[PDB]
């Protein structure tokens, strides 16, 4: 009889990293959670992907409906009058794919609408109704996603937009560190829950949608999205809870920002900006706008990264650097 050894068996306890994802809606937080799942975890199994079929269809239909309604609000006519009929059917059949089944009729409606010239004229002005950034992804792949045998690919799942009700968490192991990553939205909660959420936080990743710089304001909004995010990041940087915390800034959606900066002047967001409307200088200006909100720059540093949260390779690289920083400060 050989007495059994210790349960640990010579293994040390893993160091735990409490990481908080913060940022305004649509900044890329949940996309980063899903990227963590893809990179440092199992990925997504077919039983997991089949679950997102209904979500893919719902996001597609909601996006095309948002564009169609925007057309009515913006006084944009259809390129071909026939499309009106299609539009009507889209509202009749909007709930047809709740069973995960997109009928051929609905697919034809969406295809004929997405083809129209007026619908594309409205899509190009998407900034006037804050269209979500996954619309074109699904709509341009309509032929593929419409098939009956269709199962969402991993990139299809990254692009889904899901409503968050409770505690969105993911866990993984990276560089012998146990990461507890919590996605924190804008929901209202009890103060004790916030105290528990902000206690012992090792790192914060604050996500900022650069491409939100030119979006119109919704009614009763006191300021544009970029300035809302600047307000949030100010409160984050200069708070007592996070004096110990590593503050990381993900200037996300750089791929969309690069295409936008050509057509849309940064002055829409920052009227004082006198620089050029190029990717490099506008990006530097936004970076400095957020960084200068740090009112204790000597004692505390802000680690800034430009990211495309939907690009798994870029996210992997950036998170490797982020983890190096976390280790350095521990």
């Amino acid at each position: 009889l050989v007495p059994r050894g210790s349960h640990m068996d010579g293994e040390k306890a893993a160091k735990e990293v409490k990481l908080l994802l913060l940022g305004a809606g649509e900044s890329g937080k949940s996309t980063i959670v899903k990227q963590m799942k893809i990179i440092h975890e199992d990925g997504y199994s077919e039983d997991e992907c089949k679950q997102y079929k209904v979500v893919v269809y719902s996001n597609t239909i909601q996006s095309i409906i948002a564009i169609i309604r925007a057309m009515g609000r913006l006084k944009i006519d259809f390129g071909e009058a026939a499309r009106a009929d299609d539009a009507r059917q889209l509202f009749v059949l909007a709930g047809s794919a709740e069973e995960g089944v997109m009928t051929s009729e609905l697919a034809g409606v969406i295809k004929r609408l997405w083809r129209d010239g007026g619908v594309q004229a409205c899509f190009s002005r998407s900034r006037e109704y804050q269209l979500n950034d996954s619309a074109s992804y699904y709509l341009n792949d309509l032929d593929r996603i419409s098939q009956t045998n269709y199962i969402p690919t991993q990139q299809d799942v990254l692009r889904t937009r899901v409503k968050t009700t409770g505690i969105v968490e993911t866990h993984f192991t990276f560089k012998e560190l146990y990461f507890k990553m919590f996605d924190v939205g804008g929901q209202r909660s009890e103060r004790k829950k916030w105290i528990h959420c902000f206690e012992g936080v090792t790192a914060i990743i604050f996500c900022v949608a650069l491409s939100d710089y030119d979006l119109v304001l919704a009614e009763d909004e006191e300021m544009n999205r970029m300035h809302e995010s600047m307000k949030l990041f100010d409160s984050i940087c200069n708070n007592k809870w996070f004096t110990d915390t590593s503050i990381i800034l993900f200037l996300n959606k750089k791929d969309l920002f690069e295409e936008k900066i050509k057509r849309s002047p940064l002055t829409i967001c920052y009227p004082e900006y006198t620089g050029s409307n190029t990717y490099e200088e506008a990006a530097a200006y936004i970076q400095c706008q957020f960084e200068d909100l740090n009112r204790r720059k000597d004692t505390k540093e802000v680690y800034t990264h430009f990211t495309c949260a939907t690009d798994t390779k870029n996210v992997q690289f950036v998170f490797d650097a982020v983890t190096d920083v976390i280790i350095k400060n521990n």
């Binding site: 913060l22 924190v184 804008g186 929901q187 209202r188 909660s189 009890e190 103060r191 916030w194 959420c197 902000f198 307000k231 949030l232 409160s235 984050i236 708070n239 007592k240 809870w241």
Partner: peptide, 12 residues
């Protein structure tokens, strides 16, 4: 009552 995390942080 219930409050967003931003308003919670700024309460101080």
């Amino acid at each position: 009552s219930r409050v967003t995390w931003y308003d919670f942080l700024m309460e101080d």
